Amino acid sequence: PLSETKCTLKSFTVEKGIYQTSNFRVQPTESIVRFPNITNLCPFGEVFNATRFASVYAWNRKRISNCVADYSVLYNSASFSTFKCYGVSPTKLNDLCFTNVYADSFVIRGDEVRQIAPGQTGKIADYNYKLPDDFTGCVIAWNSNNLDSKVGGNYNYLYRLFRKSNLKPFERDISTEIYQAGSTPCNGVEGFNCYFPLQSYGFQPTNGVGYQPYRVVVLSFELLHAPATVCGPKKSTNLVKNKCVNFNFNGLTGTGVLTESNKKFLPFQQFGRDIADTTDAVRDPQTLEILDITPCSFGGVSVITPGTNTSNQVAVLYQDVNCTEVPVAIHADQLTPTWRVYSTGSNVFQTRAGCLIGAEHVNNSYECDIPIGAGICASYQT
Amino acid sequence: TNVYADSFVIRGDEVRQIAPGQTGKIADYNYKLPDDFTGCVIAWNSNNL
Amino acid sequence: NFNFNGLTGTGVLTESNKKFLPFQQFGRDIADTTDAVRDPQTLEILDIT
Amino acid sequence: QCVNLTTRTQLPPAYTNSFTRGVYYPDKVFRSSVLHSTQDLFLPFFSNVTWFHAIHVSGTNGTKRFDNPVLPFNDGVYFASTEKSNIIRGWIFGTTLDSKTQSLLIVNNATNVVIKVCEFQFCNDPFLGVYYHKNNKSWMESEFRVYSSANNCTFEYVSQPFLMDLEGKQGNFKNLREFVFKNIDGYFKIYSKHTPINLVRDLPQGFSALEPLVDLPIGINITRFQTLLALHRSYLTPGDSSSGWTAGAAAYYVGYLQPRTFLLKYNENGTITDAVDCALD
Amino acid sequence: IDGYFKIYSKHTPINLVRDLPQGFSALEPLVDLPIGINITRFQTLLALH
Amino acid sequence: NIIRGWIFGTTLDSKTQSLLIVNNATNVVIKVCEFQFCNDPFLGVYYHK
Amino acid sequence: VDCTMYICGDSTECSNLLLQYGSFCTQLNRALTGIAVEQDKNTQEVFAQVKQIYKTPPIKDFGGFNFSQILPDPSKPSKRSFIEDLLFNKVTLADAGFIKQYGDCLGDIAARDLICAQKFNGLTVLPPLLTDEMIAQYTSALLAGTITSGWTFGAGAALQIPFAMQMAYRFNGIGVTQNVLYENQKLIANQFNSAIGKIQDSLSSTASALGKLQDVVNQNAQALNTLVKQLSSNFGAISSVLNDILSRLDPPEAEVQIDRLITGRLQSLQTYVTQQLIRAAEIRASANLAATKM
Amino acid sequence: VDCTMYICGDSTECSNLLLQYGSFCTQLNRALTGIAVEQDKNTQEVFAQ
Amino acid sequence: LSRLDPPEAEVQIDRLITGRLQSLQTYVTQQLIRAAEIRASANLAATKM
Ligand SMILES: *[C@@H]1O[C@H](CO[C@@H]2O[C@@H](C)[C@@H](O)[C@@H](O)[C@@H]2O)[C@@H](O[C@@H]2O[C@H](CO)[C@@H](O[C@@H]3O[C@H](CO)[C@@H](O)[C@H](O)[C@@H]3O)[C@H](O)[C@H]2NC(C)=O)[C@H](O)[C@H]1NC(C)=O
Ligand SMILES: *[C@@H]1O[C@H](CO[C@@H]2O[C@@H](C)[C@@H](O)[C@@H](O)[C@@H]2O)[C@@H](O[C@@H]2O[C@H](CO)[C@@H](O)[C@H](O)[C@H]2NC(C)=O)[C@H](O)[C@H]1NC(C)=O
Ligand SMILES: *[C@@H]1O[C@H](CO)[C@@H](O[C@@H]2O[C@H](CO)[C@@H](O)[C@H](O)[C@H]2NC(C)=O)[C@H](O)[C@H]1NC(C)=O
Ligand SMILES: *[C@@H]1O[C@H](CO)[C@@H](O[C@@H]2O[C@H](CO)[C@@H](O)[C@H](O)[C@H]2NC(C)=O)[C@H](O)[C@H]1NC(C)=O
Ligand SMILES: *[C@@H]1O[C@H](CO)[C@@H](O[C@@H]2O[C@H](CO)[C@@H](O)[C@H](O)[C@H]2NC(C)=O)[C@H](O)[C@H]1NC(C)=O
Ligand SMILES: *[C@@H]1O[C@H](CO)[C@@H](O[C@@H]2O[C@H](CO)[C@@H](O)[C@H](O)[C@H]2NC(C)=O)[C@H](O)[C@H]1NC(C)=O
Numbered sequence A: 001p002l003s004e005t006k007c008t009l010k011s012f013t014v015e016k017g018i019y020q021t022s023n024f025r026v027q028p029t030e031s032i033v034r035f036p037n038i039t040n041l042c043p044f045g046e047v048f049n050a051t052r053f054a055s056v057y058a059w060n061r062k063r064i065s066n067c068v069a070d071y072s073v074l075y076n077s078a079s080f081s082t083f084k085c086y087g088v089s090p091t092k093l094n095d096l097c098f099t100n101v102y103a104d105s106f107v108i109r110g111d112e113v114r115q116i117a118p119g120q121t122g123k124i125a126d127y128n129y130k131l132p133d134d135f136t137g138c139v140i141a142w143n144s145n146n147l148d149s150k151v152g153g154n155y156n157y158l159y160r161l162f163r164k165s166n167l168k169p170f171e172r173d174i175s176t177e178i179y180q181a182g183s184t185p186c187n188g189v190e191g192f193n194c195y196f197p198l199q200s201y202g203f204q205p206t207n208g209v210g211y212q213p214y215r216v217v218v219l220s221f222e223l224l225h226a227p228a229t230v231c232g233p234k235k236s237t238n239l240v241k242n243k244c245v246n247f248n249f250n251g252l253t254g255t256g257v258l259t260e261s262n263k264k265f266l267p268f269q270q271f272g273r274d275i276a277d278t279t280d281a282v283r284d285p286q287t288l289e290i291l292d293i294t295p296c297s298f299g300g301v302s303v304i305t306p307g308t309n310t311s312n313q314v315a316v317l318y319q320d321v322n323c324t325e326v327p328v329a330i331h332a333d334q335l336t337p338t339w340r341v342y343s344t345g346s347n348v349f350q351t352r353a354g355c356l357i358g359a360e361h362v363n364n365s366y367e368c369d370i371p372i373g374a375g376i377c378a379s380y381q382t
Numbered sequence B: 001t002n003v004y005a006d007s008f009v010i011r012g013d014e015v016r017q018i019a020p021g022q023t024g025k026i027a028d029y030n031y032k033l034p035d036d037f038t039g040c041v042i043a044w045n046s047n048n049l
Numbered sequence C: 001n002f003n004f005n006g007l008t009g010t011g012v013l014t015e016s017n018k019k020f021l022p023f024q025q026f027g028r029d030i031a032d033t034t035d036a037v038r039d040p041q042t043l044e045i046l047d048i049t
Numbered sequence D: 001q002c003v004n005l006t007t008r009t010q011l012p013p014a015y016t017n018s019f020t021r022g023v024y025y026p027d028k029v030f031r032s033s034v035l036h037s038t039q040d041l042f043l044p045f046f047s048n049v050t051w052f053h054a055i056h057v058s059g060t061n062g063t064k065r066f067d068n069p070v071l072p073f074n075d076g077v078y079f080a081s082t083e084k085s086n087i088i089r090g091w092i093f094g095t096t097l098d099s100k101t102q103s104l105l106i107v108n109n110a111t112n113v114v115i116k117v118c119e120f121q122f123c124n125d126p127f128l129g130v131y132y133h134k135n136n137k138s139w140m141e142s143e144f145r146v147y148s149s150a151n152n153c154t155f156e157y158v159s160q161p162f163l164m165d166l167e168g169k170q171g172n173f174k175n176l177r178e179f180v181f182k183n184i185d186g187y188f189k190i191y192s193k194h195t196p197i198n199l200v201r202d203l204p205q206g207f208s209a210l211e212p213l214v215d216l217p218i219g220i221n222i223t224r225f226q227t228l229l230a231l232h233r234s235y236l237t238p239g240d241s242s243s244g245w246t247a248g249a250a251a252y253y254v255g256y257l258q259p260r261t262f263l264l265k266y267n268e269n270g271t272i273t274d275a276v277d278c279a280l281d
Numbered sequence E: 001i002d003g004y005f006k007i008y009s010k011h012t013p014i015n016l017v018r019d020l021p022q023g024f025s026a027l028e029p030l031v032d033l034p035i036g037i038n039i040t041r042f043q044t045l046l047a048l049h
Numbered sequence F: 001n002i003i004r005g006w007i008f009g010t011t012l013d014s015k016t017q018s019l020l021i022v023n024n025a026t027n028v029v030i031k032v033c034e035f036q037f038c039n040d041p042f043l044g045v046y047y048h049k
Numbered sequence G: 001v002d003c004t005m006y007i008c009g010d011s012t013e014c015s016n017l018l019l020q021y022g023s024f025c026t027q028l029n030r031a032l033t034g035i036a037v038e039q040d041k042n043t044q045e046v047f048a049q050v051k052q053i054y055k056t057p058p059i060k061d062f063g064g065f066n067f068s069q070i071l072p073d074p075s076k077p078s079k080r081s082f083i084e085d086l087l088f089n090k091v092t093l094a095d096a097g098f099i100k101q102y103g104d105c106l107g108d109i110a111a112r113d114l115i116c117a118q119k120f121n122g123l124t125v126l127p128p129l130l131t132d133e134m135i136a137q138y139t140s141a142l143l144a145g146t147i148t149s150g151w152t153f154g155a156g157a158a159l160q161i162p163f164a165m166q167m168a169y170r171f172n173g174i175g176v177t178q179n180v181l182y183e184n185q186k187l188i189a190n191q192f193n194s195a196i197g198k199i200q201d202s203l204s205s206t207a208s209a210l211g212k213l214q215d216v217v218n219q220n221a222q223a224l225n226t227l228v229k230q231l232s233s234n235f236g237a238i239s240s241v242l243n244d245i246l247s248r249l250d251p252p253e254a255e256v257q258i259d260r261l262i263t264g265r266l267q268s269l270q271t272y273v274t275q276q277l278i279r280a281a282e283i284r285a286s287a288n289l290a291a292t293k294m
Numbered sequence H: 001v002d003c004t005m006y007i008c009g010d011s012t013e014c015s016n017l018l019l020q021y022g023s024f025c026t027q028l029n030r031a032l033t034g035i036a037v038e039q040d041k042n043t044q045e046v047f048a049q
Numbered sequence I: 001l002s003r004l005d006p007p008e009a010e011v012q013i014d015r016l017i018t019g020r021l022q023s024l025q026t027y028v029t030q031q032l033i034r035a036a037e038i039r040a041s042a043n044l045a046a047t048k049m
């Protein structure tokens, strides 16, 4: 505490007085990792080794649940030229759980890959497939030029060229109502100013790169605000109560002291929030117990200092510690804890201002110097 | 100053994994740049060599 | 006319809103006359008027 | 096999105010929106309850006490307890609580509930207990020293497997377990209610009625009974089987039933919400 | 909204005769249906006796 | 149990896909199809005597 | 204020980034310290005016006058007068003379208890140097001083003066002849004794007069509660919670989000300190007048 | 001060974004109100003696 | 709002909102300082009255 005062004041010398210091803090000693009881691996094969992809015209949406998102399983044989995540840094994927997870699946032309991103325009972005402005997922794409290609052209892949308006995010429209143009009434018949709304792709194996077919997978998911049925490969540990710990609960990290709670979460609520929107309770993913999370740091400390040009001894006042040696129960497993002080010395004095450690106490009274508080002062004497 | 050049051959789809902050088998197991990388990266298609 | 698990009587059976505890088969009114029963096959509560 | 615990500090009994506790539903009848007059053996209102304060593990001059005395049954027993860690686990009901006659043993042990009526040779200082710690943080139960032997067993009941929470806790009491035990005409009738609490020192003031729970067809003479508590043992408290133990975080109360008449108030859903002890004043 | 048809609900006992009861409660999330369609109008389906 | 379902959509006609939600006897079915809807759709219960 | 805890409570990455806004965190602390020093000086200037602490005389014969509800009641554990107990009982403080222990917040209660919630966000309250008992001793001394010597208890050695004479001199001061006091001594004493009882009864009945003191207390409480509520603001960030930022983002992205929250939290603290300084100037002015009037 | 109008006068998108630091907008007005109240008291103390 | 899509516009709007709030905070602070001075003047004037 004296050095802390010296650092604060940018000085090697501290004048006699009272200085405030940082709150008393303790460090966490172990980490608790908890994930839901998921035993299965996610259907990476079905998603990336599919016999067929939908045309962009009428894209598919697969729901994903009760599995491990171990993305590394694709490292042995998949190769993706295109990759971009929007709602999360990709380096964090293995420490997170994912929820409300869906995989959109379709085929587009290579020059159209750039139109998938949110905020883009063009015939695909406007008429076939669109992501929202605030998309929170990640996009994967690759050059399937030996799967989706045919010598005479692959005409099983279709896209919409005409619509009277643009699509909203995640919409599909499979209507074949003939497109009318030029205020020229049309009774469903292709002709002047009347078009079938759909067109096919070529995708011959002999075309240049911009014309090769590409497979696009869009992973749409949410993080940290709901129970998850899909999670990364990180292994869990046992949970320790009434200790200062580090933790990871379904991707939500932090530190603090976990205590049992009496809060009653609804069946769909995984996490709670306090009055200033900070998580203060969680529902454990393996057993649905509710635990309150209390910060490790607390209280306050101040230091009673004689001039440092006289003595390097100081006395320390603890704002949240009584120091009265009240008899307590013996926990069977735990040993009775100590006072939240940096050190307990030879002189412990208890007052209304908090307990003071290191100053001798006398029953005398005098003129105030180096005021401590609540009727108490101190001085340096032989 | 303190100038070094790192040099290697990878697959073209993996070029994107060189940038710091990326993941993938190269970014995770073969070669990685730091979060605060202060340098510059150059790459090209040596398809005839 | 009726017989509910041996308890006989006559009257008009209407659906009720009384909530019997899991162990209560029959109820009683203010002058100790049965005025509701729990049906033995489906646990519906019927008032007897 | 059993052992006498020899480290207990000798402390006096405490007494408390029963207030309005010990009320139960008089029959299996649905009643509502009515006041009803009945007669039965009930804990009298504002009665003298013996307080078996039993958490004395604290202090340098330790007061460790594991209080499991034999108490009279009289006309029926009001029993209640407050606990935070599943310590109060059972009872012995009988004549002399000895091998000479049959008696009733009810124990909630880890993973099951067993009720037997046997000629048990009971321990003078019976107990249950949990010991394992250190290699892993799970607590494990292994001690059962209630009786050394038993024979001529009848009414053997075993419940279904379950898991039990053994870990000791700090903080307030969490579980109020209220019971009424009666021995009438061949039946041992037990009524009960489990209510959440957050108290620190004594039986909470308040009112509820207990539900019928069970009727046990056991034809025995119950004159006295004994409360069965579990011990906390660990690496932290060395000693042999008579000394290497601590008291856990639980305590209990005993009152007695007397014939009384009551006015009971049933609300619109048939819940007893209040009562008048007609002989109180 | 944005590809989802969100439905919230609550089921409450009533004993009214003529109109929507006055009172307050909040509905629970129930379900999120991932249906990418344009809903502009709707129709209520009733059964006949 | 008369109010059993809803139709949600564009024109509520066969030209486009729309959402049909119905609570029918014994089950609940939700489908999104190019339905050719009735102008006066209904469900119903008949048998008696 | 623990200016680190308010911003980066229990967060390592935030804590290191926050080191850059260094002398500023310290500057806020200096400003609050200066206020705290003045609050004790103000108390001392108003009450600790005379270092001679006089005991209430054993003689209560101050002419026909009573004064017992003004003077300290020796039968109480307190050193307060009857009127003072009412003043103290009517103003509501969140608490007083008590220290909350860390273990007291290890429960659900931490989220309901504003004192606990403020402490966990680095906001603390310092105890006064002078206690109620010491103040009671100062008012006791002043009363003993003025009841016996009156004007002369100050500006020199105290001189005892008969109470009737003290008032005769006070009347001469106003310009009322001394003859009035002696001729009407019983009237004056009866009017006074009645007036004091009326004040005491008025105080027992209506506490609204104390609203000024209640407001000082409420205003500081509100300012601290505001600092806690403001923690929820995003300030351009994705989320106001550091843990959400740290969980989803890598360092270089997390840093942007963190800087946005640090700036916002700093604005909240700077605003707080400024308001406390303005309020401090106003309380000093009141205290200076109070000291002057004493 | 109408602290919303000053920032997002007649602008919906701005207004919604402005709701996040909402307590602040309120506190600015509270401070101004305190001044405004004191101004009438000052007049009263000087003249209404 | 005219030239930018929402997520880009949000950056630009946040800069202006922060800016405008800082301006208002400055205003309020100055008014509070001036208010202290006017009160002092009023108190002196009241004393002289
Ligand atoms: C917060 O919740 C508690 C506990 O209630 C239980 O948990 C909730 C989350 C819900 O799921 C509840 O449906 C569930 O019961 C509430 O405490 C309880 O309140 C009820 C009254 O609503 C009390 O009932 C009384 O019981 C006495 C004795 O029988 C009667 O005389 C009374 O007339 C009345 O029926 C009940 O005892 C009480 N529980 C405990 C342990 O004290 C709490 O009120 C609720 N808070 C709020 C703001 O709603
Ligand atoms: C500091 O400790 C004293 C000592 O009392 C004991 O420890 C307390 C924390 C509390 O647990 C007491 O019950 C213990 O006896 C406290 O003084 C006590 O104050 C309480 C409340 O008024 C009173 O019930 C006790 O009898 C007092 N005990 C004695 C012997 O003085 C004091 O309040 C504590 N200060 C704090 C926590 O701020
Ligand atoms: C996707 O399909 C490829 C095959 O095209 C799978 O890769 C093969 O995996 C087996 C082991 O099961 C190896 O023996 C083969 O040598 C691999 N083939 C190639 C070309 O590398 C791949 O595992 C499938 N991916 C998923 C997620 O199911
Ligand atoms: C959702 O359906 C509505 C109703 O049909 C569409 O709005 C109409 O669009 C046609 C052109 O296709 C116009 O001629 C009408 O005047 C529009 N009506 C109204 C009330 O605006 C709307 O465009 C559809 N949305 C999407 C994304 O397709
Ligand atoms: C606890 O101590 C008591 C004595 O205070 C023991 O009681 C005696 O036990 C012996 C057998 O060892 C009998 O022969 C005596 O007749 C018993 N005396 C009485 C008065 O009962 C008791 O057995 C001890 N229990 C344990 C578990 O050690
Ligand atoms: C708790 O009591 C049960 C029931 O008495 C114990 O389980 C029995 O163990 C015996 C061993 O001889 C078996 O023959 C029974 O079939 C078991 N019963 C059941 C229902 O499984 C159980 O071991 C006791 N708990 C502890 C911790 O010892």
Ligand SMILES: *[C@@H]1O[C@H](CO)[C@@H](O[C@@H]2O[C@H](CO)[C@@H](O)[C@H](O)[C@H]2NC(C)=O)[C@H](O)[C@H]1NC(C)=O
Residues within 6 Å of the ligand: D132, D133, D135, D136, D138, D140, D142
């Ligand atoms: C925790 O560790 C203890 C100690 O090794 C395990 O309990 C032992 O189990 C063996 C049988 O495998 C018994 O022979 C020992 O007597 C037991 N120990 C004690 C002190 O009684 C316990 O099973 C482990 N628990 C978990 C969850 O791993």
Ligand SMILES: *[C@@H]1O[C@H](CO)[C@@H](O[C@@H]2O[C@H](CO)[C@@H](O)[C@H](O)[C@H]2NC(C)=O)[C@H](O)[C@H]1NC(C)=O
Residues within 6 Å of the ligand: D151, D152
């Ligand atoms: C209760 O158990 C005892 C055993 O402790 C029974 O005693 C029997 O006594 C006869 C005497 O002729 C012996 O031949 C038997 O072998 C004994 N039985 C056993 C199991 O040892 C006694 O009969 C039993 N009483 C009842 C009612 O069951």
Ligand SMILES: *[C@@H]1O[C@H](CO)[C@@H](O[C@@H]2O[C@H](CO)[C@@H](O)[C@H](O)[C@H]2NC(C)=O)[C@H](O)[C@H]1NC(C)=O
Residues within 6 Å of the ligand: F024, F025, F026, F027, F028, F029
């Ligand atoms: C209520 O709807 C269900 C579901 O559509 C009907 O049951 C289905 O009947 C078809 C007949 O072709 C079967 O192929 C399906 O397998 C059945 N589904 C299920 C879940 O059983 C049911 O018959 C309808 N109710 C009534 C009264 O007609």
Ligand SMILES: *[C@@H]1O[C@H](CO)[C@@H](O[C@@H]2O[C@H](CO)[C@@H](O)[C@H](O)[C@H]2NC(C)=O)[C@H](O)[C@H]1NC(C)=O
Residues within 6 Å of the ligand: G060, G065, G066, G067, G068
């Ligand atoms: C001052 O007035 C008080 C009453 O306000 C007088 O003391 C009371 O004396 C009666 C005697 O019957 C007691 O019952 C009251 O309890 C006393 N009250 C208090 C507050 O002490 C007191 O004697 C008067 N003193 C002088 C000097 O006139």
Ligand SMILES: *[C@@H]1O[C@H](CO)[C@@H](O[C@@H]2O[C@H](CO)[C@@H](O)[C@H](O)[C@H]2NC(C)=O)[C@H](O)[C@H]1NC(C)=O
Residues within 6 Å of the ligand: G186, G187, G190, G191
């Ligand atoms: C001045 O007025 C007061 C009343 O305000 C007079 O005192 C009261 O006289 C009545 C006469 O009936 C008594 O009952 C009251 O007890 C008296 N009050 C007090 C406090 O003594 C007083 O006499 C008048 N004085 C002069 C000079 O006219």
Ligand SMILES: *[C@@H]1O[C@H](CO)[C@@H](O)[C@H](O)[C@H]1NC(C)=O
Residues within 6 Å of the ligand: A036, A037, A038, A039
């Ligand atoms: C799921 O529970 C079983 C016990 O039934 C346990 O053995 C397994 O390790 C748990 N699961 C996971 C996915 O970690």
Ligand SMILES: *[C@@H]1O[C@H](CO)[C@@H](O)[C@H](O)[C@H]1NC(C)=O
Residues within 6 Å of the ligand: D015, D016, D017, D047, D048, D049
């Ligand atoms: C119960 O009776 C005993 C008799 O020794 C007495 O000391 C105690 O105070 C009584 N307690 C109550 C709560 O009435």
